[PDB]
């Protein structure tokens, strides 16, 4: 019928990882990744890099509609972020696969991302756990910056200096969001400052707690 | 539609996910192959890269699991579904590390419902240049690490790690760990032996049927 | 009621992926949008990234068209003359070298003709783009495959190069050539080709 997550997909049978139609608070139709599979499935995929086919380093405007393809990397939105995590209370998960294979994740308690005139404004719960490590420790109401729309709390420009948009305040090393490096490779995701991890894989989604 | 041959008979040229709707209606999206010796085949088993886990329970291999943009496995309920009417041949296509193709064909091919376990039913192995590597595995029964249905007196779904229609195993197969060895070539990716005491390596595997 | 991607990024698809259209007349066919690519709402009929499609095929099987929409394909030919027979369209081709490099070349109009004009090309002008026009000279040349060769040179263009492409007196492969330098040939070697149209 009318799914309002990728929750009541796997309720009704969808037992494999793919997109599907679910309808948003106010019945907007979106087509989003789902996430079957991982940690008891449900989960709503809103973000993706695996081989940096795609630029991440994007306007407010790009970022604020979502972009990238659904056959590879992409962002879904911050205006559909917000509107999937607007009602109730959904938790977050970060999936990550270094360059040998090893998945690794962090999990969230409670996130939310606020609407556009809040600038995204990140609401992040406790840090549940996870091998990946808690590299959003901290960052619960830090708005969001990209390289046209500085937020962060820095004196430089987080979003250029990092290359990538993110919910940035005082700014020390790139994230999920910043350019996948070629020949550290990937994008990266540390909890522990001064020291860089490097991923192959990435997906940040979210599942109704 | 009941099956990918029928959306190819619809005109869907490109292989894809299409939804089909088993004997009981309900609605099932497949991955058909439509380019593949005919095309018309669905798709129950896809391994390309090891990011999927194929270790898993009874339950999931009977619900099916993984990824419609990757690996997975479409669920035994599905494949008994999809094969417990008429006849359907059963194709294996691999690529090895060098990307050659190669494929096993089966005459007929089905899976039995839950209540037997999902023993493999295989007809005649009728060529391939992957070699005939199900040879004497008709009426084997399915065995997870959780549900142990071989003829052995060890779990072999433990012992190679992944779910198959074992009898008493000897050596890894389309469902076992996604190997990532020191040497492209072999020993790497998954297994699917040629002849007896003949391994081969391959990074890419799909196991689809098609009415006969 | 969608007739391309144009109609659909402008309906809220603003994420690349398979959707169905309707051609002219009527019938449905799921394509792939770039809804990514300069401005999005590009439908792509042609995308090779790995070799894993065999492109030496028959006039029977680029009539239809063939491949994969979860990675190499060939739209069909008959659907791409549907997709460019009304109005003006604007053709772009996407490269990807092998180290990540994104190259383009953009023409002003493209249409394939009928079967009847054995799939003619009609080609614009070269809008611009970093790989370089490698369809000049291409207008109104005939589309051939190994089993219909309807080029100009003495030889039989499509098995020399063992692809098809609308050959004049071939000196080179192109994106419909064999998957190797590695890749395909792009007037250069690419990991990466897609080549997808929009209305102008
Ligand atoms: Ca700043
Ligand atoms: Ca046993």
Redesign the pocket.
Known sequence: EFPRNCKDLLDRGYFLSGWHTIYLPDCRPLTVLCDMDTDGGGWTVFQRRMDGSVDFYRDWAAYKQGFGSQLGEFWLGNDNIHALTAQGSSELRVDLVDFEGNHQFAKYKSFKVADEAEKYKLVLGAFVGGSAGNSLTGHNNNFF?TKDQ?????????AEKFQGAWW?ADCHASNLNGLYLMGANGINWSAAKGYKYSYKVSEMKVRPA
Request: charged content about 20%; hydrophobic content about 10%; aromatic content about 10%.
């Open positions: 910056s500085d937020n962060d709390v820095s004196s430089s420009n987080c940035y």
